[PDB]
Every structure is written in C-alpha cells, then in structure tokens.
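Input (Beta-fructofuranosidase):
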Amino acid sequence: QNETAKRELEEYIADKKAEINPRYRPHYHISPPVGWMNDPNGFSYYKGKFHLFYQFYPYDSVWGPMHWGHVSSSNLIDWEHLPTALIPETEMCFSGGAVVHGDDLVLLYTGRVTTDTDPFYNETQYLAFSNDGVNFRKYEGNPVLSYVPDNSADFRDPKIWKFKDHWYVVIGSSSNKQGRVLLYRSGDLFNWEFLSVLGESDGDMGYMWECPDLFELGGKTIFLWSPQGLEPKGDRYKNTYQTGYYIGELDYETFEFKTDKYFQELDYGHDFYATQTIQGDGKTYLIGWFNMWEVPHLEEEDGWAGTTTLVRELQLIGTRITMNPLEGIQDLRTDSVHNGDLEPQQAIEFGPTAEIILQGCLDQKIELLIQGKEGGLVTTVTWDPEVGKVIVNRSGEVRQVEWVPIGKTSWRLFLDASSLELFCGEGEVVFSSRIFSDGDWVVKNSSPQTLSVEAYRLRRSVPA
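Output:
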C-alpha cells in the first residue's frame, strides 16, 4: 500500500466527520463515515465475521474516483467501520466480489482506466489479497482477466463463487447497445477461461447489465442483476435503473442458463439498486444500495450520500423470491410504543426509528401517513382494495403493485432517520424508499377502519 495516500485519507475522514449533519443519518443501516456510497461489493464471511465493502467516494457527497469502503459484523445487524480497503491509482476501484481461498480474503474487482479513443475508458478485472481482514494489496500483474467478447469497453462487476474444482464468475457487459452477462471460470484465480454469454438483451432488456449474480434458491438457479435501459411499463421499471431476476437452471457441463427470460423486479420501492448475496447455514442473505442514480439525494447537502438496505433472507415461494428481515432483527427493539387497536385518525410517535407490524381487513382501504413531528414532506403507504394494489407515495412519486397474499396479510414496516422498508405478507411484496421529513417519525392511521398495530423504537446498530 502507498502509506502517504492511506494516512492522508484516514485523517481526512477523521477531521471531516464532525461536519456531517446528523439529521438524516441512519441508526441501523450502514452509511459511509463521510462522503458518497453506492453499490455494495465483496459480501463475504472470513475468520468468524461477515465482511461487506462498498463503492466509496470519500471527498464529496457525489460520485467520484472509486474507492472500496469496508465494514464487518458478527450478526449482520451491528456493523463497525474498517479503514478503506482499495484506493484508486491508474485504475478506479469499480464493483466486484470476494472469496476466501485459504488464509486469505481475495477481492476480484473491476479496474476502469482512462484512454484517448471514443470510449475514453477500458475495464478489466484486478485481484487484491488480505491475510488479516484489514490490509489489501493489489496483484503486481493486474489485470488477470482482460478478454471480453466483441472487445466491449463495458466489462464490470464480477461475482465469483466456488463450485467443485473451479471458481466461476459472472461479469456485466454490452454489445451493439444490448446488455449481457458473461461466464468465465479458473482453476487458480489468475488464469480465466471464457465459457459463454449467459444472457443478452433481445432488445427490451436495456443496453448495459450491471451487478450480476448467480446462485441456487429453492432448487432453481437465480440470475439476479441490475439492467440499465428498460422503459417504464405500466407500474413497473419506473426507477432510473432496475434490479431483478430470471429463474432457470445453469448447466455446469454446457454452461447454458436455461430460462424463459420472465423478468421480475426484486424490490418495488424508489431507492433499490445493485445487490450482493452470500449463502451459509442453508440461508441466502441479500443487501442492496439504498439510493438511485440520477435523482435528487436529500442527504447530499449534509456532507454524505447513501446507505445499505437491511440484510434480507431470501426464499423461492412458487415463482417469487421473498425478502424478510433477519430472524434476529427483533434484538434492535427498545421501547414498546403501541399494542392493539389504532382507531381512524389516531397516530403513534417514535424517535428517528420505528418497527410497525400492522393488520387490517383487506376488504377496506388501509393508509398510513408518515411525517416528521415538526411537519414537512409526507409519505403514504396504502392498500386500495378496489384495484388490489399496495401504493407507496413518497412526496408525490408513486410506486405501486398488485398484491396477492401468499398467506399472512400483516405488514412489517421499518423506518430509519431517512428510510422506509415495507415487508408485505411473507415478503412477496417489498418496497425500499428513502424518506425525509422534519423531526421524529409520527405515523397516523388514515384508514376508514381500526388497525391492529404492534410497534417499537429501535436502538442504533451502526456508527453515527
């Protein structure tokens, strides 16, 4: 590591931390200590802890030369900051994955370097190793993988896993303005063999395919990724860019991903993009970036931007990937704020944090009005039985979807200082949206019916 570049960053973070306006800072979602966060990177389990990295620009609350930020956790709820894992050099440290080989946590990340020809950048895959979970050194002969079909300038966001005697990687690319995902494998992490174009836009699925992922869930192969360039279609794909999946089967002999190419959005909210997953103890865990490209970030003027989502557990129920908060998120609960009937026009007061489990009759409208104790911007969460939709209206911008309950008809709602996560039913319908208002959360029953409501305040689990 360049010790001057390192120490200069450590003390820049240390100094700048007191200038961060705390008003929108999350209590129990990972935020950068200062400046800008996007895509989570290198989700991994190493010497008894979960590690997560993230696309990080230290010096401003907007995007810039890409670093990898770094946190760890014992329980996927409480997270502590570590020193910055990767600093840009000739290459910007773009998104990537992590695996444990032996004594080492290995990072596989995209290096973007500048050029003088129309693209003006090229992307190749770089390696870095740590033996202590803290210090990361780049491989002397980076990049290890440069070959991309049709010499596409786009070649990024590797996700690496081990299956038998090979490491496999899926990587995002484009060709002729059509998004695609590439599959490679290696016996040794340094030498990579191109296997196949695992998928490609037939014209309707966008021009670039970011943050790909591939894993087994409910006996099927999931292909999960963040396509760019879908057009809004009725209620769907209204965010700048999308995150969603195909269901199929990866054949490890032909390297074909057999699928009907039926696309589903994972999260129906305003501010969900770019995921990581990890598997252990028979569970599959997912986390995403809790923000969106090319839209206002109300926290930006406060000297920082972006959080992670809660970690979700995944299941495949019929054709739907369900998301639920961790089995032990209940440990965040401090004060019991409400239990039992919440009459029409009755409200509950929290601090900056809330967990609300509510039930109503689905034959009648359900509506919560969420706003700061000192007033300001409103978010409404609505069940409209006339159209059979859950509707999240964030300061006038609507996200909505048809809801057919799998089983449970209750909702579980998490508020943080500037965020909302609504888990409908058994997790088949989830909305993640950044929300901003003036002061501690007040939630009012706008329904024409009494609701049953179990509500808590939640303690902090992440740094300030």
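Residues 204 and 354 are 39 Å apart (CA to CA).
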